[PDB]
Ligand binder design. Structure first.
Ligand SMILES: *[C@@H]1O[C@H](CO)[C@@H](O[C@@H]2O[C@H](CO)[C@@H](O[C@@H]3O[C@H](CO)[C@@H](O)[C@H](O[C@H]4O[C@H](CO)[C@@H](O)[C@H](O)[C@@H]4O)[C@@H]3O)[C@H](O)[C@H]2NC(C)=O)[C@H](O)[C@H]1NC(C)=O
Ligand SMILES: *[C@@H]1O[C@H](CO)[C@@H](O[C@@H]2O[C@H](CO)[C@@H](O[C@@H]3O[C@H](CO)[C@@H](O)[C@H](O)[C@@H]3O)[C@H](O)[C@H]2NC(C)=O)[C@H](O)[C@H]1NC(C)=O
Ligand SMILES: *[C@@H]1O[C@H](CO)[C@@H](O[C@@H]2O[C@H](CO)[C@@H](O[C@@H]3O[C@H](CO)[C@@H](O)[C@H](O)[C@@H]3O)[C@H](O)[C@H]2NC(C)=O)[C@H](O)[C@H]1NC(C)=O
Ligand SMILES: *[C@@H]1O[C@H](CO)[C@@H](O[C@@H]2O[C@H](CO)[C@@H](O[C@@H]3O[C@H](CO)[C@@H](O)[C@H](O)[C@@H]3O)[C@H](O)[C@H]2NC(C)=O)[C@H](O)[C@H]1NC(C)=O
Ligand SMILES: *[C@@H]1O[C@H](CO)[C@@H](O[C@@H]2O[C@H](CO)[C@@H](O[C@@H]3O[C@H](CO)[C@@H](O)[C@H](O)[C@@H]3O)[C@H](O)[C@H]2NC(C)=O)[C@H](O)[C@H]1NC(C)=O
Ligand SMILES: *[C@@H]1O[C@H](CO)[C@@H](O[C@@H]2O[C@H](CO)[C@@H](O[C@@H]3O[C@H](CO)[C@@H](O)[C@H](O)[C@@H]3O)[C@H](O)[C@H]2NC(C)=O)[C@H](O)[C@H]1NC(C)=O
Ligand SMILES: *[C@@H]1O[C@H](CO)[C@@H](O[C@@H]2O[C@H](CO)[C@@H](O)[C@H](O)[C@H]2NC(C)=O)[C@H](O)[C@H]1NC(C)=O
Ligand SMILES: *[C@@H]1O[C@H](CO)[C@@H](O[C@@H]2O[C@H](CO)[C@@H](O)[C@H](O)[C@H]2NC(C)=O)[C@H](O)[C@H]1NC(C)=O
Ligand SMILES: *[C@@H]1O[C@H](CO)[C@@H](O[C@@H]2O[C@H](CO)[C@@H](O)[C@H](O)[C@H]2NC(C)=O)[C@H](O)[C@H]1NC(C)=O
Ligand SMILES: *[C@@H]1O[C@H](CO)[C@@H](O)[C@H](O)[C@H]1NC(C)=O
Ligand SMILES: *[C@@H]1O[C@H](CO)[C@@H](O)[C@H](O)[C@H]1NC(C)=O
Ligand SMILES: *[C@@H]1O[C@H](CO)[C@@H](O)[C@H](O)[C@H]1NC(C)=O
Ligand SMILES: *[C@@H]1O[C@H](CO)[C@@H](O)[C@H](O)[C@H]1NC(C)=O
Ligand SMILES: *[C@@H]1O[C@H](CO)[C@@H](O)[C@H](O)[C@H]1NC(C)=O
Ligand SMILES: *[C@@H]1O[C@H](CO)[C@@H](O)[C@H](O)[C@H]1NC(C)=O
Ligand SMILES: *[C@@H]1O[C@H](CO)[C@@H](O)[C@H](O)[C@H]1NC(C)=O
Ligand SMILES: *[C@@H]1O[C@H](CO)[C@@H](O)[C@H](O)[C@H]1NC(C)=O
Ligand SMILES: *[C@@H]1O[C@H](CO)[C@@H](O)[C@H](O)[C@H]1NC(C)=O
Ligand SMILES: *[C@@H]1O[C@H](CO)[C@@H](O)[C@H](O)[C@H]1NC(C)=O
Ligand SMILES: *[C@@H]1O[C@H](CO)[C@@H](O)[C@H](O)[C@H]1NC(C)=O
Ligand SMILES: *[C@@H]1O[C@H](CO)[C@@H](O)[C@H](O)[C@H]1NC(C)=O
Ligand SMILES: *[C@@H]1O[C@H](CO)[C@@H](O)[C@H](O)[C@H]1NC(C)=O
Ligand SMILES: *[C@@H]1O[C@H](CO)[C@@H](O)[C@H](O)[C@H]1NC(C)=O
Ligand SMILES: *[C@@H]1O[C@H](CO)[C@@H](O)[C@H](O)[C@H]1NC(C)=O
Ligand SMILES: *[C@@H]1O[C@H](CO)[C@@H](O)[C@H](O)[C@H]1NC(C)=O
Lengths: 135, 112, 121, 442, 135, 135, 48, 112
């Protein structure tokens, strides 16, 4: 049994599989965000610099974003923040093992800033509680 | 959100009698700091709104002796010993702890 | 004295815009909150919005789906509000009330003005 | 019990550092060129209370940064259009006597020359009208001929001023004071920070500021060491003084081909009368404006001193006369009428005879130059006077009856009146705080 | 009560408040270190690249620096390092709730490298004890 | 006794010492990957940008690589993954305190991708188990 | 080794005549044309 | 820091008698490795400094029988059975575990 839903499904390969089966393929996705231009006049000189800087900047924005939330250093991390149930009145089995991830983000894209608007508040609140216990 | 309802929709009173008005909060308004920022404002008929009680235990400047704010948690009340033309109006109970800072539903004091 | 000067009355037309000013005088405008209030004669007071005359942070009521744009000026000590493009049933008087400090926040609704009659017709 | 250290990230801290800024323009040209990223129309300005900050006017790198920035734009915009190498041929010139006013007798010089046509093996005789300040007797040659020959202003790329917004990169902040009594240097108790500065017009002048940002309440005299006469005194008014400038001639433009796909535009034949270019400023407004300036200026000097004004102290045409670039045609104007007064303790216009020089030498870098083609018809100008750049005369004895004259002319001072509020600072997010902390040992 | 000392005081807004009240405003500060130039010839071409790279490099130096100290991924983190009391003989109430942070950093800027000179040594030590316990 | 095998042996100074003694010199090595060009036309203009971007890009690749493995934020970290003993049949004392690190990497450079091919799988597997306990 | 990977159970939208790749290539090669023409002889004196 | 003091400021001794000199450390010098790197050096009057005892239990080369270094923890001592012209001098106890590597205060041996 060599065929297991795993990395060898390919970069972006899990985009066609259910959300639950796509969790194990999250490592093949973070690796292809920096490399690919390792090996090396105006044309293609500035373009190479512009592309490289943008790729570095884009990845950093997510790394910084995970840093504020406190989930940095863990590929799959979750905080203690609850969410307004009105966003999606669906069961766990009704989300993970019966629908693809690609259309999922479209429905919830409206509240991406709102849901982000609760993560950092809790993380700072968690730090403050640790400060109280710390003191 | 926490709604603010007041039992008296119409309150018939003659000059020289004690008036009673109350308000309710769906959820307790006791803030973590240990205070209730509820405000009782009597909006005059056509004039600018004017507060009468803030921090219901405390009272505002130009203290009228008749007005006596009291109440905590869910129940809020304001007792007036005597009625004057100024007393005739609309009272609003305004919460000051949760979002939004909802006002009261409005209790009307009229002579019939 | 802490006063919030407001225009007397404005007569606008459907499809037009308004510049609802609110002058600040007799105090420091860079600290106190500023909020607007509706005083429909036949209805109770309604919460319209709030503008922080400092960082410029803006908050809007849930029922409004961000129909208004709030602007302030720290040089002339003034506050402005857009509707934007209100309609007939919203023809009433708006009051620009001064809030408390962002730290204490207990003195909210300390002072009011006179309002302005918005009658789109 | 003994307190330990804690690491704090992002806490507000400022360090005085200066770097390269960025350009932003509002919705071809020479300044923007549709290249700067547009700036959103929500300039969120935030007021920081309970704070004071230090501002070092005349040391800000923003002034230096803008001075070098626009020069690069000037060189960039001049490269892609025709050079004027073959215009240095001998000029057999003649006077103009057709309906000439006595005041401008012998100013324009009708000229003819054998400049080449498009075909390399053929010549052509072309006549053009040149101002006296563009030719020199050897019979005549262009003033710039013995110096490096210069290009021709790309006709299409106008030099009309456009506001430019300067924004610092991420990790840096720009602080602006707001106190109405702000001097050149000193603490301001109304510090505020904004990512992008307001519209700054790079319009040019040497004596009178044009289209500048006026003061808030009163006329401000912003100056470093004042007892030293060697440094200029910068004055910013509070109510604009309208200035009218116009060119009465109905000039026409002639296009002459110089080579393959390279055309040169000449002047003439002129149509109509020959009248000197003149500017106009209200007499009543100017007297009031000057009276206000001396009133504030008298607070820094003796009250009984008799303040006097006079024209410039002479020199090269570039600095001795007022300059501006209205309508794409340069004007050098003699402002002796705006400083002929004396002030003792306790009719609707002025005629300023202006001058036009068609060949332009830009910033005192002498190796560069440019040609500005003429524009058909009359040109009208409406601008605002916002201040002056005066200079203090030496040799004063006992500091009595002091006088000032217009001068300076350095381009840096013009922007200093607009960048004095804004300074660039650096954010130091890292920090350490002492408190009673015990790390959770695993 | 919508007015609480919080993010909406503005970026750098806490610089005028006391040190204690500025702790809750540390999240609005890390967010404005990368963005602002997301939306987009020599002039302004190289300058954009120079500015973008410098901003990216500057943020990295702090992220690296927090990484060596072991505080990476926690906005408010602390170690078990004691400090020489001679630097500031002041009480907690005498530091946090009675003076602004801006003038604070000026006084102790002298020992910034010295105080840094103790953080990394202990973090490497703390790893060494974990290695000893690990083994 | 001021002379202890420590940082002052110099950047890259541990390359001549045994592997065990080189563990304490791993902090002087991470510091010299970004700085050195802090203080500042085509020649030397593009070159400076190319060099700076490459240095930033190279460091981020390792930081991202450690992030996927879950060891980010810890200079010395180890997972629970076992390794095929056939790669090096040597004792701990026979590896650390008797041979330099420089020639070490040469012998096992063949399996660098293979050994990396097990780290990320375990880290994701660790997260999945945490998700199971989490749920 | 142009590793092409097939994504099943998925559909995507393609906007021909709106792709920026067409615009990118059109401007790119023109820059190459101008770059390659700069370093050799001009023909100014052939207009006799 | 840890100071190194010695009781004998002046030590009057005749040829053929046992000499005693001691030193003290404010804090114990027992290093984690399990050794005391204290050095007893007798600085000659005008010549280059010369060590006499290192690792006080151990002794240096060219062993003199009279010198016998002993002591641990806080107390350090060096007993000399007989006095010679070389013995007359200044002895320094040098701590070798903490920073700085402070020397001794100096004990003078002179004949009066
Ligand atoms: C100080 O600010 C004022 C305020 O704008 C400014 O006045 C402006 O002057 C310009 C120049 O004359 C005006 O725009 C011109 O208007 C005339 C008449 O309509 C046009 O013929 C001009 O067109 C020419 O220039 C165009 C490029 O700008 C060419 O594309 C065109 O083909 C023509 O050659 C030009 O549009 C402008 O209207 C006024 N503004 C106001 C509000 O009156 C003044 O010039 C500034 N001071 C200085 C010293 O620049
Ligand atoms: C694309 O969609 C098709 C839809 O038919 C998928 O077909 C189904 O695939 C699964 C596994 O790939 C097959 O096995 C099933 O697995 C589940 C979970 O282990 C098990 O509970 C079932 O009993 C079944 O054995 C399944 O038979 C097959 N057919 C169906 C669902 O009708 C296909 O897998 C999808 N491929 C990708 C890459 O998303
Ligand atoms: C030169 O100075 C004059 C003043 O002497 C300036 O005139 C002023 O121009 C501003 C706009 O730039 C006017 O404000 C505008 O008012 C209209 C309503 O009329 C309003 O809709 C706009 O939003 C704006 O607020 C101002 O009233 C006007 N003042 C006078 C006395 O005319 C002129 O703009 C200056 N020009 C330059 C180039 O600096
Ligand atoms: C700038 O303009 C001013 C005037 O607008 C010029 O000053 C004028 O200079 C002429 C030539 O000297 C003066 O005319 C002569 O004045 C003497 C004085 O004694 C008189 O005796 C002669 O008969 C003759 O009139 C003229 O008076 C003077 N204008 C004023 C108002 O005094 C100045 O030369 C101009 N400078 C430049 C550089 O263009
Ligand atoms: C700028 O400095 C002034 C100095 O007067 C500050 O005024 C003080 O502000 C505080 C809160 O903003 C006011 O409330 C106080 O809060 C503390 C802590 O909750 C409480 O223990 C006190 O009893 C008091 O209620 C205080 O009344 C006010 N006046 C003072 C201190 O005299 C102002 O807050 C500062 N603003 C900023 C943005 O730093
Ligand atoms: C370079 O290689 C030479 C090989 O001789 C090393 O010489 C040895 O260095 C060690 C410490 O530097 C000396 O002390 C030894 O330490 C161990 C561990 O603490 C201890 O168990 C031993 O009893 C001994 O005291 C050792 O005497 C010396 N000689 C040898 C090994 O024959 C030298 O250290 C190396 N230097 C570097 C920088 O790698
Ligand atoms: C500037 O002011 C001068 C002086 O008033 C004006 O000169 C007038 O010109 C007209 C012809 O257009 C004559 O009829 C007047 O007699 C002149 N005035 C005087 C006092 O001689 C000039 O027209 C003004 N120009 C502008 C553009 O405003
Ligand atoms: C300057 O020129 C203008 C236009 O030629 C003169 O006319 C004024 O024009 C403005 C509009 O820009 C009007 O608002 C004024 O009412 C006009 N004034 C008059 C008297 O008609 C203006 O008078 C000139 N001013 C000076 C001092 O020369
Ligand atoms: C400044 O104004 C004075 C007016 O007194 C000018 O002085 C005259 O200048 C002309 C030539 O410029 C001479 O012919 C006169 O003899 C001078 N007379 C006097 C009394 O000085 C002076 O030239 C002006 N200078 C500038 C630069 O404008
Ligand atoms: C429900 O939504 C509101 C905003 O519409 C939000 O303030 C609230 O936090 C949400 N509920 C939860 C549990 O997050
Ligand atoms: C999300 O937003 C879009 C437009 O903003 C709207 O059309 C859609 O109905 C929204 N969906 C939900 C679930 O709110
Ligand atoms: C041309 O004008 C100049 C101006 O001074 C004069 O000297 C010269 O004599 C004039 N020549 C003719 C021919 O008019
Ligand atoms: C131009 O050429 C004609 C024809 O030979 C000649 O008469 C005239 O002098 C020339 N002019 C100049 C300025 O060389
Ligand atoms: C060019 O000629 C003018 C005419 O006087 C002179 O002033 C200038 O110095 C000359 N320049 C050079 C570089 O010869
Ligand atoms: C501004 O700076 C000048 C020069 O140092 C000084 O004399 C003055 O007192 C300062 N303050 C004001 C308000 O001018
Ligand atoms: C210039 O400044 C110095 C000190 O800054 C002062 O002593 C002097 O009087 C000022 N004026 C002159 C002319 O030096
Ligand atoms: C200049 O001179 C030429 C040659 O005589 C003549 O044709 C032309 O009309 C003159 N131009 C003017 C403006 O006098
Ligand atoms: C300008 O003001 C001065 C000040 O007294 C006065 O002497 C002079 O007559 C005034 N001039 C005009 C034209 O008003
Ligand atoms: C000049 O007079 C004003 C009042 O008119 C006064 O404030 C000022 O001090 C006086 N100047 C001097 C140098 O005393
Ligand atoms: C100043 O104006 C008066 C007014 O008649 C005039 O007599 C005098 O010559 C003028 N002086 C200057 C220097 O312009
Ligand atoms: C200049 O003269 C020409 C001759 O026909 C005329 O068409 C044009 O309108 C005139 N220009 C002006 C500004 O009067
Ligand atoms: C006291 O300062 C010294 C350096 O002057 C330092 O070595 C020592 O570690 C400090 N004390 C503490 C407890 O950190
Ligand atoms: C900090 O250092 C500066 C200069 O290095 C010195 O002037 C100041 O006194 C020092 N402060 C302390 C508290 O050591
Ligand atoms: C032994 O090597 C094989 C590949 O040759 C690998 O699959 C296996 O995981 C290795 N053993 C261990 C314990 O890692
Ligand atoms: C490592 O690989 C090289 C070439 O790929 C080979 O020569 C060498 O024998 C290999 N070593 C081991 C231990 O597999």
């Amino acid at each position: 049994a060599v065929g297991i839903g795993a990395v060898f499904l390919g970069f972006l390969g899990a985009a066609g599989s259910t959300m639950g089966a796509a969790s194990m393929t999250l490592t093949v996705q973070a690796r292809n965000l920096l490399s690919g231009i390792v090996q090396q006049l105006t044309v293609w000189g500035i373009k190479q610099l512009q592309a490289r800087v943008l790729a570095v900047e884009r990845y950093l924005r997510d790394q910084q974003l995970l840093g504020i939330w406190g989930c940095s250093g863990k590929l799959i991390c979750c905080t203690n923040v609850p969410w307004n149930s009105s966003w999606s009145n669906r069961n766990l089995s009704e989300i993970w093992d019966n629908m693809t991830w690609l259309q999922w983000d479209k429905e919830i894209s409206n509240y991406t800033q709102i849901i982000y608007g609760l993560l950092e508040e809790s993380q700072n609140q968690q730090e403050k509680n640790e400060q109280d216990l710390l003191a | 959100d926490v709604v603010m309802t007041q039992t008296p929709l119409t309150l018939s009173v003659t000059i020289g009698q004690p008036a009673s008005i109350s308000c309710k909060s769906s959820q307790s308004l006791l803030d973590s700091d240990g205070k209730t920022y509820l405000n009782w404002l009597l909006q005059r008929p056509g004039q600018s709104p004017k507060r009468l009680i803030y921090l219901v235990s405390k009272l505002d400047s130009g203290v009228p002796d008749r007005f006596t704010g009291s109440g905590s948690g869910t129940d809020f009340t304001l007792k007036i010993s005597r009625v004057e033309a100024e007393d005739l109006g609309i009272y609003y109970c305004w919460q000051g702890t949760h979002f939004p800072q909802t006002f009261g539903g409005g209790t009307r004091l009229e002579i019939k | 004295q802490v006063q919030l000067q407001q225009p007397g009355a404005e007569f606008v037309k459907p499809g037009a815009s308004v510049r609802m000013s609110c002058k600040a005088s007799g105090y420091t405008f860079t600290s106190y909150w500023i909020a607007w209030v509706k005083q429909r004669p036949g209805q109770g007071l309604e919460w319209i919005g709030d503008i922080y005359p400092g960082s410029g942070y803006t908050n809007y009521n849930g029922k409004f789906k961000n129909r208004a744009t709030l602007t302030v000026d720290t040089s002339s000590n003034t506050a402005y509000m857009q509707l934007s493009s209100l309609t007939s049933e919203d023809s009433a008087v708006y009051y620009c009330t001064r809030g408390g400090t962002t730290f204490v926040a207990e003195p909210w609704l300390a002072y009011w003005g006179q309002g302005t009659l918005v009658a789109v017709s | 019990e003994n307190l330990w250290v804690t690491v704090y990230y992002g806490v507000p801290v400022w360090k005085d550092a200066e770097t390269t800024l960025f350009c932003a323009s509002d919705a071809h040209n020479v300044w923007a060129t549709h290249a700067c990223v547009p700036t959103d129309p929500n300039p969120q300005e935030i007021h920081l209370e309970n704070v004071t900050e230090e501002f070092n006017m005349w040391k800000n790198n923003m002034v230096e940064q803008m001075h070098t920035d626009i020069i690069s734009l000037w060189d960039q915009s001049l490269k892609p259009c025709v050079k004027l190498t073959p215009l240095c041929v001998t000029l057999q010139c003649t006077n103009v006597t057709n309906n000439i006013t006595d005041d401008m007798r012998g100013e324009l010089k009708n000229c003819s020359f054998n400049m080449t046509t498009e075909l390399r093996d053929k010549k052509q005789k072309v006549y053009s009208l040149f101002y006296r300040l563009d030719v020199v007797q050897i019979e005549y040659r262009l003033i710039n001929c013995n110096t490096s020959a210069c290009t021709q202003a790309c006709p299409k790329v106008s030099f009309e001023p456009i506001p430019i917004h300067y924004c610092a990169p991420a990790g840096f902040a720009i602080l602006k004071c707001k106190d109405k009594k702000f001097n050149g240097t000193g603490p301001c108790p109304s510090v505020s920070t904004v990512q992008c500065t307001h519209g700054i017009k790079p319009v040019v002048s040497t004596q009178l500021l044009l289209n500048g940002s006026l003061a808030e309440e009163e006329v401000m005299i912003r100056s470093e060491n004042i007892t030293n006469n060697a440094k200029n005194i910068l004055v910013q008014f509070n109510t604009p003084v309208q200035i009218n400038c116009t060119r009465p001639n109905n000039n026409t433009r002639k296009s002459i081909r110089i080579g393959p796909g390279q055309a040169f535009y000449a002047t003439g034949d002129i149509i109509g009368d020959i009248r000197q270019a003149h500017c106009n400023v209200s007499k009543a407004t100017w007297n009031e404006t000057l009276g206000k300036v001396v009133k504030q200026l008298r607070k820094h000097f003796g009250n009984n001193t008799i303040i006097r004004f006079a024209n410039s102290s002479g020199g090269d045409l570039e600095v001795t006369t007022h300059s501006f670039n209205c309508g794409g045609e340069f004007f050098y104007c003699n402002t002796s009428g705006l400083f002929n007064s004396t002030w003792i303790s306790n009719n609707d216009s002025i005629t300023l005879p202006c001058r036009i020089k068609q060949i332009i030498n830009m910033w005192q870098r002498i190796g560069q130059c440019m040609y500005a083609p003429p524009i058909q018809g009359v040109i009208r100008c409406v601008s605002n006077i916002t201040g002056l750049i005066l200079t203090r005369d030496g040799g004063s004895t006992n500091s009595t009856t002091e006088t000032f004259r217009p001068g300076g002319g350095d381009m840096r001072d013009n922007w200093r009146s607009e960048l004095y509020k804004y300074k660039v600072v650096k954010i130091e997010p890292l920090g350490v705080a002492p408190t009673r902390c015990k790390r959770r040992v695993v």
